[PDB]
Symmetry: C3
Subunit: 45 residues, 3 copies
Amino acid sequence: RMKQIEDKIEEIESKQKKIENEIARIKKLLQLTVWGIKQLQARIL
Amino acid sequence: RMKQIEDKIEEIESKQKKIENEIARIKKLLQLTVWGIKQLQARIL
Amino acid sequence: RMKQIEDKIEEIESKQKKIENEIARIKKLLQLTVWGIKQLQARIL
């Protein structure tokens, strides 16, 4: 039962790292879209 | 003590699924905004 | 071995709060980009 607890926490930790990596990707793409909107407003203005 | 720990893990897992669903929602909306920017650019060019 | 478990649970919980704060920041900026695209579309159409 103690091994199951340890393994569960391992699985949670690996998954949290994947979530963190995905958040990092999301922030970068979000910043691209900010920049993209900025360029389009400046072209139309 | 082991039940206390297992209960804590259960709350972590619940929260993690909440986070995962939040990130799915974000990625879907980000996909839309990327698309919308691509459409506007094509229009103005 | 037992206190490593306790340390890790508490570190995962902390990391989940960090992640939820990042998600809240992402959602705010997303809502801004949604608004900006809507404004640009209206201007060009």
